[model samples]
Target: YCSRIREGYTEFSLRVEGDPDFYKPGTSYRVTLSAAPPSYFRGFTLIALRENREGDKEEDHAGTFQIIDEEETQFMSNCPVAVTESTPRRRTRIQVFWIAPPAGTGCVILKASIVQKRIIYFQDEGSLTKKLCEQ
Candidate 1:
């Protein structure tokens, strides 16, 4: 997440672990960021799994973040993980992946925050990314 402060910028990243059942196919997850006002807070920039594959450079994921408010930031997606399981882990073990805004984009210093809350088996670890519950 990115937040603009007076003199510089503040940023944060979070990692969460959860059981695979929490995330389902074709369901959108709503993520919220809490904080004070900056001069402005530009929203998020998503980098999905499509960009991570080989020879699939031509394909582009659907979605973009536009600045709406400074108090909160959100990103929702129907399918947060790749369709075909590429990793060795179980499909239930993985969740959404995210990328933070580039530096100098705002005043907030980038750092991980505390876990706020989890919803629908989807846990909030204070960072942008989340995972499924382990054994």
Candidate 2:
């Protein structure tokens, strides 16, 4: 089953466009962050990859730092929004192009977190594999 989480009234999700089984290094892919804007959320910072196997944390990342009470999570590469979207969206769809990493990048995971006027927030994570060579 597809997994999703929410906090308060706002909800959001992140996913690859093709739901790719693996990434093609030196190629560009899509990463989307969608949200159900709640209340009067002023702003958002949507990011790809906040959690990793090595247990690392990246601040200044777009959206996320809150969890849905529980759960645990690859992700290498860069995913930047492909479009321009303003926040306070009841349901927001922000998409970006993610460039896959080079050889031996291993499995990659993408995670996200959302905030509502700094009042309510939640997070969820997803994974995509990385192959040294493309299919």
Candidate 3:
């Protein structure tokens, strides 16, 4: 269902607290999704994926999410440890905890998909891009 959403750009931004250049393995970060001014998100999904490795292949889900607000977020079906909107009601921001995988885990990136409406959304939007490396 999420895979079929239209691809488009947005003023909305995805950001992580502390703005760390590198993420420590086995640590957690407070990730936030902010909607553009005057705009609100109806839904979203957040996940972590391996950033770099031999063959540049994507390993399994890189990390896990811990919901800080159960009334605003929940676990997404089919995406173990991934998070999604608890309701489709309009919202300006959503924050959750993303715990990095253990040491030996390659660089990982925090990615998300945001839906402003049925026709506008963003997919694979990496908040930190390939910038958050595991140290």
Candidate 4:
């Protein structure tokens, strides 16, 4: 059967909340991906989010933040995080720690690829670019 992928009515938010200007160099913060369930009557699967790059250099990144503890960060590499969770939880947040790189890192793009599954999963891509500053 020839078919096309439909929009999975899901929404995600890549947020940073801490001190004012959470996006700073050589600092630690939160990286959250909140998912809005596509339906009030159905559940999703294989929900994943990944940080990508577009013509960005290595120094523009905060090394690699790890996924050991959500609050305390480690080597968070440029990779995809499979946040296997349910929307029914009301607030589906892929929360993690993000340690900003040094000042000389220049501008960095926080790229992301997100998808929610039902019968036919849907995918969406986005990014947030921030220029590192000395404060």
Scored by lDDT, the top model is 3
Off by over 4 Å in 3: 1-9, 52-59, 118-130
Error of 2 at 93 (Å): 1.3
RMSD of each: 16.3, 11.3, 4.1, 8.6
Candidate 3 C-alpha error for residue 4, in Å = 8.4
Query: What would the TM-score be for candidate 3 when compared with the true structure?
Result: 0.79
The window of 10 residues in a row where model 4 has the poorest summed lDDT is: 41-50
| Global lDDT of model 2 | 0.41
Instruction: Give the count of colliding residue pairs in each prediction.
Output: 15, 12, 0, 7
Cα deviation at 20, candidate 1, in Å, is: 7.3
Model 1, 1-135: lDDT tens digits are 111002122333322223234333333333333223321222332233222222123232322223333223333243232121222221111223323233222221111222213211112222433332212
lDDT of 2 at 80: 31
User: Which residue pairs of candidate 4 clash?
Assistant: 64-75, 64-76, 65-75, 65-76, 66-74, 66-75, 66-76
TM-scores for every predicted model: 0.26, 0.48, 0.79, 0.48
Q: Compared with the true structure, what per-residue lDDT tens digits does model 2 show for residues 85-132?
A: 243444345455667665555554454444555533323322222212
Preferred candidate (TM-score higher): 1 or 4: 4
Residue-level lDDT tens digits of model 4 in 55-103: 2343323434536443322222232222223333433555555566665
Clash pairs for candidate 3:
none
Stretches of model 4 off by over 4 angstroms after superposition: 1-10, 19-22, 37-61, 68-91, 118-135
Local accuracy by lDDT, each model: 0.27, 0.41, 0.69, 0.39
Best-first order by lDDT: 3, 2, 4, 1
